[PDB]
Amino acid sequence: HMSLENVAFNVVNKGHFDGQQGEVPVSIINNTVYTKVDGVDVELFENKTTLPVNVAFELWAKRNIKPVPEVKILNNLGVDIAANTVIWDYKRDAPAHISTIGVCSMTDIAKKPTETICAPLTVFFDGRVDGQVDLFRNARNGVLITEGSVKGLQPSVGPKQASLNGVTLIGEAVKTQFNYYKKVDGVVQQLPETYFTQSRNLQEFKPRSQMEIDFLELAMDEFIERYKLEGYAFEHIVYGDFSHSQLGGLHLLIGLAKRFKESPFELEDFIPMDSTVKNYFITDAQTGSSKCVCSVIDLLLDDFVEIIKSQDLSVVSKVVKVTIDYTEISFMLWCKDGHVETFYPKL
Amino acid sequence: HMSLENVAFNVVNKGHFDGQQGEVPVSIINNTVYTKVDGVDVELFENKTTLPVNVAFELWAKRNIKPVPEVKILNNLGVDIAANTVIWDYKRDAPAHISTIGVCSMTDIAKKPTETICAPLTVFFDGRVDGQVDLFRNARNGVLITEGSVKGLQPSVGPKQASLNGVTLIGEAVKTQFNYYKKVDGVVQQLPETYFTQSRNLQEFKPRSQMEIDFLELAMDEFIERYKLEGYAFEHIVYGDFSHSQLGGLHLLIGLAKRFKESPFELEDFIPMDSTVKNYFITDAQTGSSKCVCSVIDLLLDDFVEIIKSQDLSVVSKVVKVTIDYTEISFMLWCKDGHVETFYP
Amino acid sequence: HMSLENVAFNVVNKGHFDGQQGEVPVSIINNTVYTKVDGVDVELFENKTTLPVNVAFELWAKRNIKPVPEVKILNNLGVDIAANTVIWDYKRDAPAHISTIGVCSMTDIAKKPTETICAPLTVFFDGRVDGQVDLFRNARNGVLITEGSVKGLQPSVGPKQASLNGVTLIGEAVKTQFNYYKKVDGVVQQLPETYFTQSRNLQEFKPRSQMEIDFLELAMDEFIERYKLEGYAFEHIVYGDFSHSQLGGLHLLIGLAKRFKESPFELEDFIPMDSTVKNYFITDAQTGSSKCVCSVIDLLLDDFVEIIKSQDLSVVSKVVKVTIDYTEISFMLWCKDGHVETFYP
Amino acid sequence: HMSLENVAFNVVNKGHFDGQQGEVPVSIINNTVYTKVDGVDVELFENKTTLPVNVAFELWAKRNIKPVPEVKILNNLGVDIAANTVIWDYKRDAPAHISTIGVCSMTDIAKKPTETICAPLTVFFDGRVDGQVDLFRNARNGVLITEGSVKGLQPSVGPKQASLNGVTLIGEAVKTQFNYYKKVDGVVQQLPETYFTQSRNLQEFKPRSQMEIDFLELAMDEFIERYKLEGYAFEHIVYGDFSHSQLGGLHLLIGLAKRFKESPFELEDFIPMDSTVKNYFITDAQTGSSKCVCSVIDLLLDDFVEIIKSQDLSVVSKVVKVTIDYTEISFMLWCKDGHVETFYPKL
Amino acid sequence: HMSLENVAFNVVNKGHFDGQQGEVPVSIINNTVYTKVDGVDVELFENKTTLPVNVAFELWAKRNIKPVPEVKILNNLGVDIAANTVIWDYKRDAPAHISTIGVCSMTDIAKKPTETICAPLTVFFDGRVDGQVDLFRNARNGVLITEGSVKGLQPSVGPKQASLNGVTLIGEAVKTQFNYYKKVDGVVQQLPETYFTQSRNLQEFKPRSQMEIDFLELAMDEFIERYKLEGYAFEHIVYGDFSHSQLGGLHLLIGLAKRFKESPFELEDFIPMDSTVKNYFITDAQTGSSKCVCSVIDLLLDDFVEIIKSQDLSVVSKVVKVTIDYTEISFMLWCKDGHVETFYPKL
Ligand SMILES: CN(C)CCNc1nc2cc(O)ccc2c2c1C(=O)c1ccccc1-2
Ligand SMILES: CN(C)CCNc1nc2cc(O)ccc2c2c1C(=O)c1ccccc1-2
Ligand SMILES: CN(C)CCNc1nc2cc(O)ccc2c2c1C(=O)c1ccccc1-2
Ligand SMILES: CN(C)CCNc1nc2cc(O)ccc2c2c1C(=O)c1ccccc1-2
Ligand SMILES: CN(C)CCNc1nc2cc(O)ccc2c2c1C(=O)c1ccccc1-2
């Protein structure tokens, strides 16, 4: 007996859908779900999705509450749909996938991922759930995560971090680093060598290497000296140039983090979604320096240094391709007289 | 297991809530309830009430589908709430009463009408349902209908007509004339002698007496002659005067019906609810004669004639009170030289 | 003390805003205004405009309830705004003009039409209201209607019909034919000689000449013979050709009216507004003949005949300009071998 | 002349409804009330209630702007409705009570609390308003607060704190500790002995005893030693256990406060209302330890210690009842071998 | 080819409308504009205006992204409309002006400011845009800003600060101090001598003089001694009196800033718009002292001192007028025995 009232009962009593029997009184108004508690209405859910309020509510209640891959990873791997779960996208406050399998009568295209309607879709399978490894083996198109070895399959080791209830973290009490596998048209793929973004935020940025600690602590000139980064235009690319009306560079999150601690600025996230590369409209409050489209990526600084030090610097401009989060990211490299002028990603 | 999806299953399979088990998929968008049929969304309900969409839906699904009193009667008798049913008001496309008893978890103030929260409210009880006569006897404030006698309780014979799924009718396959009873502060009240309005509509108006047939068929002068209605200003009150920019008279539905057949006009129902007396903004399409507030009542013409012929006509202006549909309706009577000038509710 | 609650009190008690003091309880939900009557919510107004619900409500309550020019006339004369009234557009269920003068604190650009903000706008003035003729004289841009002469001002006699509470009519109890005047940049303009459209509707179409009676009663061939309309392609233009997948002709309302009586069809009014020329998507239910854009005008047939009989027919194709409802309507005239092929607005 | 426009005039000119004459222009759209200022629309109110926008607006404008009991107290005492005021619930952004008396034509069931429609309802009366003590004496069902003695009536001394415009505070410039009285079916009640919750928040938590200061300053083991709390499982119940995927314990706000200062975590308030016991879905960002339903109460630590030290510890599991904020709160006590395993409230 | 989809393409690709050709898929729901990215809907804009969602979206996309005068300045100067730009009001999240010129087919009253429909309106002209100085010269009613001299016209030097993408700042990489000019009925006006508000915020308040540094650092009594402010009731007006239920004084932002650092309080901005004088409902969390209408202005403290020291103190009460931000602000001055009692602005 699946129902709006039963979903609400679960949310009230268990914090999420947990398959318990029961009903509470519910009111729907203003894209909002309320329940009655002691004669008054209490908000349980505000719909921010493009689905009907009651459907969005159910999908949210049925969200995966274990560590799951960040949505940017799933997107980059071509995932269309999940087997028997909902990946909730906390960046969009909406389901990561528009359809479901065995979750919700209004969004389900199928009850089981083996139905032929699923064949053309890349289905996400979670090896931590009994039976899902086998379903991946039978699926035409799919992506699988596991915590350990799968007999016969070569793994790709994924990022250290995963999302738990919208908190991106590196697990200590729980495992967040998965093995990844992928199948296309019934054939297992070799996933490419890749860097991974670090998924940090501007304000509570934690360094993850000695070089990052050095970057944060040292002044610009000493850092560049120590790591012998002369000619790589770090002053521009990483630290940023706030001297002109158009803000120069500032393409690495760690650089934004450093600046923010010194002097606050505004970041407009004008396409608010999870992605490997983010585009921001930045206004520096101290100087008035601004830029409409500032491309930003959170690479470990050491990774960024490896990338820029692995390029030929003998041409004015060219596109540099880098596998990051399993996708091909295009960077523009501008050089002059054998040194870098700038280097930035394209979204 | 009451639920949105179960209510929808009942509506889809049984046409209304009928206590069947089952669920269908539902989508709610704005004020509309949809169900999925073969991959597409089909509208089941558009909310026109001031309640939440899913609540209004349930109340509508649980509406009484037997003949029930017209809402104007219930309102006139001071009914606040119904015991274990929903009276759906088809004039408002909304519940007649905002709260319920034993119907819906979101609107219920009680599960049974004996709870002390119900004591100050006038609860409607339906004697056709087992147990409800006894509940009326124990209730402090209430209105009861029955199809037959209740031992010891003095009845008031109600209107001939009732509402069945929003159709007002005089039943042949079903009974629509009830006995009425009322209690206030624990004490049974004597309901007053009353006329009843006829609940007809302008376009499909059916006469219900020889006098009404005569009114519709005969020209003004011969009708007035035959029923000896000289000096009662029927030409004004009933037929209406369309000769000036302000429309004169036209206070009886039958008069509106006659004119409508001859020449169409616009009626704006600017307070769209069920009531004994209705107010309309009328514009006559043929002449341009109009009036912002035209008070209209559907009395049997014979009843209207009895009322107006039972007045003293020796005073310029006077308020005349008449019990109709159990309520006191005030009429203004204007006279001059021993004849009526006008008479309107 | 202007207020939502006071507007509602007026609507409830007087049918429209009438400047009475008082308040009733009001609820606003989405785009609907409700008032509380005996414990329940009754709808007073559903907002179909692009204004805020409470503002649209007030403008509607303050609508002009006298005969006023049809909106198509006001639009054709370039009217931007009204002085101290609201012209309600019943075709759009919205105000004819987005701003007001001396009506409503939320929409007013001025309290009096003499304020300099009004100077660039063509302000509508109603000579039936004290002071408005004088305001027109002082206004830089304006349109004036009156029921009689204004000393020194050369009149244009307007259409016979006007709109009274959304009913287009030729007044008998009230005057609906106005004199018109217009000023541009401080200078009175000579309004052109014009035909007027008749503002009839498909279903309740009434002929207004012997020729129109003949058209409706006679078969095609005898009508054309009697009025000697050979070579003017009336069979195409007026009667319509339903023989092919694309519907031919059918550009006069009277022709639509005749066919509708014989055999129903669908008309999609895909730009639902008042205008001199209307465009419809027509599907003929009997034959399946259809046309996405069928241009239709309601001219008195006699006027249409005068127009088409006053053309030179020696050129293949030509634009014919005709003043109708004070605006220049372009017609395409297609000829071949000295006869008309088609003629449409 | 009560009206939408008059309410708006009061809000604009006086900050709340204050009975002044006047009108401003108002627009209603999008569950929002706007007023026109110099040719442009300014938002005055966004409706988050289940009432009509214009009605919610009026009730909010007519909210009590003196210190008033927290809603959890009023709820716990069975209050249904207030006499001649509106208690605004700032946790729900809505009226605490669905009906009114002498406030608003759309919500009023009565103009005076003596009308017989009020008899079955528990009416809240404020002794600081002239006449209300007498109205309580005549009422069948009611709750009364005063600042001082009422002849003949034994008081219950309420919490130190009250709510002033949604700020919970202990008054210095104003009195916030009331005497409470209650009547049921025309009979004055003896209110029970009760603990009170402290109504603090996680981030700006202020200790209110030496023991709380000690808890915040000292490390776990020294605190437990000093207050001789061995065997009471404080390490679990108060400090929390973040070592496993399921977060253990953490049922006292002060424990949450301590952890939060050390290491931030996410709290989902999935039933956002005022209540003595709160249920949160917690995700610890550092470890990945989480729990869907973590029951949390803000008792003075000394009170909590008194409660746990006043229990028999000789049974595996049982329900412990405690009067808090005038209501009976059920706790589960789990023991083993004469020591506590865990102890937590139920909502 | 102007269109919803083209506006969205510009927002996605350029961060704002920049005249680029292209279209993306768009969904409109819930006063919200979404675009489709890789099979899912991403929010681009939430309409908080009283305009249609798609129109508000376009105006926002076409907002001026250079430093522009704060809206309070434009309002104070009587500006009705802007020539060929949109001034976005970030305080209201809406256009500063209801109509446009040469911006948007749905809001335009004209394509060029020379059309006669514009004659009665005060049109804002930006001298940094080619041709606009000349348009001001031909306009009947207008306000002009420039960065430098205009031949023949005497300038008024405006505030140091301007708004850049909703960030009020004093430019270093960009110019934010403009020359102002104004025309009424075809005649150039002499703008009055004026003080300017400083446009700071409570939490990140930066002093801009030695006196302000002293105010923030020194205790009350020493500050008053040093600047010889005895008898001017600074203890009341600037510092505030929290000793009674009604909060006394506290009319200068710097005073609020000082208090806030010591002890947080609640400020309800009940008319949320840009204005020279702001009215707040204040509740002090520490004491419970409150006031429904607390008028607050951010004057440089030195300016405030000059103003109060330039008044006659020999009458009980009177209105003091002060030109601030080009408008006449009325203050009430209350005196007794030759000293100030209080002094506060009226909104
Ligand atoms: C264990 N280490 C490898 C990294 C620990 N270092 C830091 N952790 C932080 C954690 C935070 O939540 C915020 C700032 C932090 C900072 C460091 C630094 O080394 C550092 C240097 C300069 C500014 C901030 C931090
Ligand atoms: C049993 N009789 C007393 C009523 C039968 N007479 C009529 N029935 C009608 C039923 C309809 O559905 C519509 C019009 C009706 C009319 C009569 C009339 O006698 C009469 C006279 C003039 C106009 C209409 C009707
Ligand atoms: C005063 N006369 C010029 C007009 C009277 N003639 C008609 N009046 C009608 C009034 C209606 O409400 C509906 C149809 C009508 C028709 C006529 C006709 O002559 C005629 C011919 C063919 C069809 C309908 C009508
Ligand atoms: C007057 N005393 C009884 C209590 C004063 N002590 C504290 N007040 C605080 C007020 C705040 O707004 C935030 C943290 C506070 C803290 C104390 C502590 O003693 C303490 C110890 C460890 C961390 C925070 C605080
Ligand atoms: C360059 N000087 C003229 C001003 C620099 N002084 C300050 N800047 C601040 C910038 C901030 O973002 C926040 C607080 C600040 C404070 C000062 C002070 O002098 C001061 C004194 C007491 C409290 C805060 C500040």
Range D121-146 burial, b when 16+ CB lie within 10 A, else e: bbbbbbbbeeebbebbbebbbbbbbb
H/E run at residue E72:
helix E71-76
Pairing status of strand D123-126 against strand D142-146: parallel
H or E stretch at D30:
none
Nearest to B262 by CA among B344, B205, B222: B205
Contact assignment for D96 to A15 by CB distance below 8 Å: no
Find the largest Cα–Cα distance for chain B: 76
Cα Rg of chain C (Å, integer): 23
Burial annotation E151-181 (CB, 10 A radius, 16+ → b, else e): eebebbebbebbbbbebbbbbebbebebbbb
Helices (DSSP H) in E219-312: which residue ranges? Answer: 220-226, 234, 253-262, 301-308
Q: For chain C, where are the alpha helices, taking DSSP H only? A: 4-14, 53-61, 71-76, 132-138, 210-217, 220-226, 234, 253-262, 301-308
Burial class from Cβ neighbours inside 10 Å (0-12, 13-18, 19+) for residue B328 reads: exposed
Counted residue by residue, chain E has a size of: 347
Would you list the DSSP string of D237-288?
Answer: III-B-SSSBPB---BHHHHHHHHHHS-EEEE-SS-S--SSEEEEEEETTT-
Residues of chain B contacting C11 with CB distance shorter than 8 Å: 270
Do residues A7 and A58 make contact, with C-beta atoms less than 8 angstroms apart? yes
Neighboring chain B residues of C12 at a CB cutoff of 8 Å: 270-271
B147, B179 Cβ separation under 8 angstroms? yes
C19: which 2 tokens?
């400047």
In degrees rounded to 5, what are phi and psi of residue B141?
A: -130, 130
- How far, in Å, CA of B159 to CA of B274, rounded? 15
Chains touching chain C, criterion 3+ CB pairs below 8 Å: B, D, E
Resolution rounded to one decimal, in angstroms: 2.0
Q: How far is Cα B242 from Cα C80, in angstroms, rounded to an integer?
A: 35
Q: Do E287 and D172 lie within an 8 Å CB cutoff? A: yes
Q: What residue's CA is closest to ligand 2, atom 1? A: B208
- Token readout for C55 is 């503002």
Cβ within 8 Å of residue D35, ≥6 positions away: D8, D12, D24, D25, D26, D27, D41, D42, D44
In whole angstroms, give the CA distance from residue D106 to residue D86: 13
Residue B152 CB coordination number (10 Å): 7
Tell me the C-alpha distance between A236 and E146, whole Å: 32
Distance of CA D255 to the CA centre of its chain: 20
**Number of neighbours of residue A68 by Cβ within 10 angstroms:** 26
Residue E284 · residue E245 · CB < 8 Å: no
Cβ A86 vs Cβ A103: under 8 Å: yes
Residue D213: CB within 6 Å of ligand 4?
yes
> With the C-alpha atoms ordered C319, C322, C328, C331, is the resulting torsion angle positive or negative?
negative
Asked if D243 lies within 8 A of A173 by C-beta distance, the reply is yes
The CA distances from residue B53 to A7, A55, B224, C310, in Å, are: 18, 15, 53, 62
- CB proximity list for B257: less than 8 A, separation 6 or greater: B200, B202, B203, B205, B216
Containing D37, the helix (H) or strand (E) segment is strand D32-37
Distance from C-alpha of C44 to C-alpha of C42, rounded to nearest angstrom: 6
- Confirm if B105 and B2 have CB atoms less than 8 A apart: yes
Taking the C-alpha atoms of residue B244 and residue B289, their distance in angstroms, rounded to an integer, is 6
**Partners of residue E125 on adjacent β-strands:** E144
Contacts D273 to A, Cβ<8 Å: 37, 40, 42
Instruction: Say what angle helices D301-308 and D210-217 make with each other, to 10 degrees.
Output: 100
D24: left (phi over 0), alpha (psi -120 to 50) or beta: beta
Contacts of E153 (CB under 8 A, 6+ apart): E181, E188
The DSSP bridge partners found for residue E261 are: none
Structure token pair of residue B224: 């007035």
Give the Cβ contact number of residue B271 at 10 Å.
18
Q: Give the closest of E50, E52, E116 to C120, CB-based.
A: E116
- Amino acid occupying residue A98: I
Question: Any idea what the Cα angle at residue D217 is, between residues D215 and D222, rounded to 5°?
Answer: 65
Which residues, at least 6 apart from C39, have a Cβ–Cβ distance to it below 8 Å? B80, B97, B98
CA distance E109 to chain C (A): 12
Q: Is C117 left (phi over 0), alpha (psi -120 to 50) or beta?
A: alpha
Up-side HSE of residue A276: CA atoms within 13 Å toward CB?
23
Look at residues E274, E254, E266, E251 and name the one whose alpha carbon lies nearest to residue E346: E251
Distances (CA, A) of A234 to A215, A278, C306: 11, 20, 85
Exp. method? X-ray
For residues C292 and A124, what is the distance between their CA atoms, to the nearest angstrom?
A: 48
User: Using a CB-CB distance cutoff of 8 angstroms, which residues of chain D are in contact with residue E242?
Assistant: 173
Pick among A24, A29, A36, A37 to test the B interface (most B CBs inside 10 A): A29
* Residue B266, beta-bridge partner list: B283
Give the Cα separation of A189 and A170 in Å (integer). 27
Do residues C207 and C217 touch, judged by C-beta distance below 8 A? no
Pick among B2, B3, B43 to test the A interface (most A CBs inside 10 A): B3
Q: Which residues of C258-290 are buried (b: 16+ CB within 10 A; e: fewer)?
A: bbeeeeebeeeeeeeebbbbbebebbbeeeebb
Give CA–CA dist E325/E76, Å, rounded: 7
- For D93-125, the DSSP string reads TEESSSSEESS-TTTEEESSTTSGGGTTS-EEE
Query: Nearest CA of chain C to the CA of E117: how many Å?
Result: 6
Answer left, alpha or beta for residue D207, where phi above 0 means left and psi between -120 and 50 means alpha.
Answer: beta
Sign of torsion, CA B299 B304 B307 B313?
Answer: positive
Interatomic CA distance for residues B146 and B124, integer angstroms: 11
Rounded CA-CA distance A298/D76 in Å is 50
Pull the structure tokens for residue A252: 């690495």
Torsion of CA C39, C40, C45, C50, to 10 degrees: 100
> What pairs with residue C5 in β-bridges?
none
- Which residue has tokens 């699904």? B61
User: CB distance from C16 to chain B under 8 Å?
Assistant: yes
Searching chain A, which residue's CA lies closest to the CA of residue B39? A106
Sign of the CA dihedral with A119 first, then A122, A127, and A128 last: negative
Q: In 3-state terms, what secondary structure has residue A340? A: strand
The CA-based angle D332-D336-D339, given to 5 degrees, is 85
For the residues of C80-143, what is the DSSP string, one character each? -EEBSSB-EETTTTEESSS-EESS-TTTEEESSTTSGGGTTS-EEEETTSTTHHHHHHH-SSEE
The atom of ligand 3 lying closest to the CA of C210 is 3
Please identify which residue in the block is written with the tokens 């607050």.
E296
| E strands present in C203-326 | 265-268, 278-284, 290-296, 317-324
CA distances for D250 relative to D189, D202, D203, D240, angstroms: 36, 13, 16, 4
* Best CA proximity match to A63, nearest among A100, A29, A31: A100
Alpha helices in chain A (DSSP H): 4-14, 53-61, 71-76, 132-138, 210-217, 220-226, 234, 253-262, 301-308
Query: How many CB atoms sit inside 10 A of residue A222's CB?
Result: 11
Dihedral in degrees, nearest 10, Cα atoms B217, B219, B221, B223: 0
- With a CB cutoff of 8 Å and minimum separation 6, the contacts of E220 are E234, E235, E239
- Indicate yes or no: CB of B285 within 8 angstroms of CB of C40: no
Do residues C239 and C196 lie in contact, with contact meaning Cβ atoms separated by under 8 Å?
no
Amino acid in the structure at residue D215: F
* Range E277-304 burial, b when 16+ CB lie within 10 A, else e: bbbbbbbbbbbbbbbbbbbbbbbbbebb
Q: Do B285 and C172 touch, CB atoms closer than 8 A? A: no
CB C306 within 8 A of CB C323: no
Helix axis angle, A210-217 to A253-262, nearest 10°: 30
Residues 6 or more apart whose CB falls under 8 angstroms from that of E234 comprise E220, E223, E224
Q: What tokens were used for C24?
A: 């009733």
Burial of B69 (0-12, 13-18, 19+ CB in 10 A): buried
Q: Which of B291, B309, B318, B321 is the catalytic position?
A: B291
Q: From atom 1 of ligand 3, which residue's Cα is the shortest distance away? A: C208
Phi and psi angles of residue A297, each rounded to the nearest 5 degrees, phi first: -135, 140
Distance between Cα B238 and ligand 2 center (Å): 18
Please state the φ and ψ torsions of residue A279, each to the nearest 5 degrees. -115, 130
Q: What is the rounded distance in angstroms from the CA atom of residue B261 to the CA atom of residue C106?
A: 43
Which site among E30, E74, E271 would you substitute to test the D interface, given the most D Cβ atoms closer than 10 Å to its Cβ?
Answer: E271
C-beta neighbour count of C18 within 10 angstroms = 15
Q: Is the CB of A217 under 6 A from ligand 1?
A: yes
Q: At residue B89, what are phi and psi to the nearest 5 degrees?
A: -90, 105
Asked if residue D161 lies in contact with residue D199, where contact means CB atoms within 8 angstroms, the answer is yes
What is the enclosing helix (H) or strand (E) of D185?
A: none
- HSE, CB side, 13 Å, CA atoms: give it for residue C342: 15
Residues in chain D: 347
Are the Cβ atoms of C42 and B292 closer than 8 angstroms?
no
**Contact indicator for A345, A251 with CB cutoff of 8 Å:** yes
Pairwise CA distance, residues E292 & A265, whole Å: 33
Q: In what order do the strands lie in the sheet with B40-46?
A: B26-29, B32-37, B40-46
* CA terminus-to-terminus distance, chain D: 45
β-bridge pairing A265-268 and C290-296: unpaired
Count CB atoms within 10 A of the CB of residue E205: 19
**Residue B149, Cβ neighbours under 10 Å: how many?**
10
**Which of chain D's residues have a Cβ under 8 Å away from the Cβ of A41?**
49-50, 92, 94
Task: Give dist(CA C326, CA B61) in Å, integer.
Answer: 55
| Neighbour tally for B114: CB within 10 Å | 15
Cα–Cα dist D125/C60, whole Å:
44
- Pairwise CA distance, residues B121 & D109, whole Å: 12
How far is Cα B29 from Cα B46, in angstroms, rounded to an integer?
Answer: 10
Is residue E198 within 8 A of residue E208, CB to CB? The reply is yes
Q: How far apart are CA E261 and CA E216, in angstroms?
A: 10
Q: What are phi and psi of D76, to 5 degrees?
A: -65, -30
Contact A1 B4 (CB under 8 A): no
Instruction: Give yes or no for C31 touching D (CB within 8 A).
Output: no
Query: Is C251 considered catalytic here?
Result: yes
CB of D23 closer than 8 Å to CB of D5: yes
Alpha carbon E39 to its chain centroid, in Å, reads 41
Three-state SS for chain B is CCCHHHHHHHHHHHCCCCCCCCCCCEEEECCEEEEEECCEEEEEEECCCCCCHHHHHHHHHCECCCCECCHHHHHHCCCCEEECCECEECCCCEECCCCEECCCCCCEEECCCCCHHHCCCCEEEECCCCCHHHHHHHCCCEEEEECCCCCCCCCEECCCCEEECCEEECCCCCCCCCEEEEEECCEEECCCCCECCCCCCCCCCCCCCHHHHHHHHCCHHHHHHHCCCCCCCHHHHHHCECCCCECECCCEHHHHHHHHHHCCEEEECCCCCCCCCEEEEEEECCCCCEEEEEEEECCCHHHHHHHHCCCCCCCCEEEEEEEECCEEEEEEEEEECCEEEEEEC
**E216 near C CB under 8 A:** no
Say which amino acid occupies E275: S
Q: Look up B251 and say whether it is catalytic.
A: yes
CA B342 from chain centre, in angstroms, equals 26
Count of beta carbons in the 10 Å neighbourhood of residue E317: 11
Tokens of D297: 């109460």
- D159 and D196 in contact (C-beta within 8 Å)? yes
Residue E25 vs residues B94, E10, E16, E41: alpha-carbon distances, Å: 40, 12, 17, 10
- Relative to beta strand E179-184, strand E142-146 is antiparallel
Non-local CB neighbours of A187 within 8 Å, separated by 6+ positions: none
Cα dihedral: E227, E233, E237, E241 (round 10): 120
Q: What is the CA radius of gyration of chain B?
A: 23
* Bridge-based pairing state of the strands A40-46 and A32-37: antiparallel
CB A346 within 8 A of CB A219: no
